[PDB]
Design a protein around this ligand. Sequence first.
Ligand code: HEM
Ligand SMILES: [O-]
Length: 153
Amino acid sequence: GLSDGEWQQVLNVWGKVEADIAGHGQEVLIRLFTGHPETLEKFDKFKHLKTEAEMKASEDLKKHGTVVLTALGGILKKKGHHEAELKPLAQSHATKHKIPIKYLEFISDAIIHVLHSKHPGDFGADAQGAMTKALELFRNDIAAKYKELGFQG
Ligand code: HEM
Ligand SMILES: [O-]
């Protein structure tokens, strides 16, 4: 798990996201979709987005970014004690949305990228380490639920 010090770092970094949840959420999804176009195909509601300009101009993409980061934020503030919050997400993403765990790796990496891109020189090495641990814990606990379900993709 994470130490108390590491959790404090995670939640301090998260304050950056909370100051502009929509902007961070938008950029995370754009980084995901542009880096990994196959991910867009999991979203029937974003398939029409054929250019990054269209992605940037999409109100609905910003809205979904807010939904995604709000859910993740709720999970992070549990400091690992997130079974009730994480179980339903793991199950909707495996059974309804059919999201391979690889894509959760992609979005985790996208969050780290966006934090550096929006806050260059202000996302320190200790902060990256702590946030990375938190995202790995999130992904790993989802992975355990995926295995229960026998879900691969
Ligand atoms: C930080 C990781 C993620 C979080 C916290 C998250 C959260 C959410 C939430 C809260 C919802 C709405 C409720 C639900 O259906 O369970 C949702 C819907 C959805 N998610 Fe995610 N998600 C994440 C990653 C991903 C990834 C990587 C993909 C695809 C590559 C994905 C695809 C979808 C799809 C297709 C829906 C439904 C869209 C719709 O019907 O309008 N999610 N997600
Ligand atoms: O999502």
